[PDB]
């Protein structure tokens, strides 16, 4: 129970983060040229919210995997100095910090 409750705590805190804006909704490949081709497994906070709400995480590890996928995707598609990339670095470091401060 504590696994998914912390997952809920951190997910809520990421969803409400100032730097969360590139990750609140799935990237729309029709608006982002090359995204479909470059990013094999899209992931975003709302998709993680949907899976978490639907009970779809077996362990806290799977939730962390989806989160890390959000940020791996971000770093794969965006320059580190891009606005989305910079936000992704803030969000990634935030996630890793929060994750480690519990686990
Ligand atoms: N509604 C938001 C605004 C724009 N937005 C991006 O531009 C983006 C995010 C991640 C990425 O990898 N590439 C582009 C995220 C969705």
Curated annotation (Swiss-Prot):
Expressed at moderate levels in most tissues analyzed, including heart, brain, placenta, lung, skeletal muscle, kidney and pancreas. Deacetylation by SIRT1 in late S phase enhances pRNA-binding, allowing de novo DNA methylation and heterochromatin formation. Acetylation is high during S phase and declines to background levels in late S phase when the silent copies of rRNA genes are replicated. Ubiquitinated. Deubiquitinated by USP21 leading to its stabilization. Residues 1-102 form the Bromo domain. It is found in: Nucleus, Nucleolus. It comes from the Eukaryota. Belongs to the WAL family. Component of the NoRC-1 ISWI chromatin remodeling complex at least composed of SMARCA1 and BAZ2A/TIP5, which regulates the spacing of histone octamers on the DNA template to facilitate access to DNA. Within the NoRC-1 ISWI chromatin remodeling complex interacts with SMARCA1; the interaction is direct. Component of the NoRC-5 ISWI chromatin remodeling complex (also called the NoRC nucleolar-remodeling complex), at least composed of SMARCA5/SNF2H and BAZ2A/TIP5, which regulates the spacing of histone octamers on the DNA template to facilitate access to DNA. Regulatory subunit of the ATP-dependent NoRC-1 and NoRC-5 ISWI chromatin remodeling complexes, which form ordered nucleosome arrays on chromatin and facilitate access to DNA during DNA-templated processes such as DNA replication, transcription, and repair. Both complexes regulate the spacing of nucleosomes along the chromatin and have the ability to slide mononucleosomes to the center of a DNA template. Directly stimulates the ATPase activity of SMARCA5 in the NoRC-5 ISWI chromatin remodeling complex. The bromo domain and the PHD-type zinc finger recognize and bind histone H4 acetylated on 'Lys-16' (H4K16ac). These 2 domains play a central role in the recruitment of chromatin silencing proteins such as DNMT1, DNMT3B and HDAC1. This is Bromodomain adjacent to zinc finger domain protein 2A. The chain holds residues 1796 to 1898 of 1905 of the full protein.
């Amino acid at each position: 129970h504590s696994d998914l409750t912390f997952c809920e705590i951190i997910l809520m805190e990421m969803e409400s983060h100032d730097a969360a804006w590139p990750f609140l909704e799935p990237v729309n490949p029709r608006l982002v040229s090359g995204y479909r081709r470059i990013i094999k497994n899209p992931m975003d906070f709302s998709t993680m919210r949907e899976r978490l709400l639907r009970g779809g995480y077996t362990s806290s590890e799977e939730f962390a995997a989806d989160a890390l996928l959000v940020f791996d995707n971000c770093q794969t598609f965006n320059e580190d100095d891009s606005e989305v990339g910079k936000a992704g670095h803030i969000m990634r470091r935030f996630f890793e910090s929060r994750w480690e401060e519990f686990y």
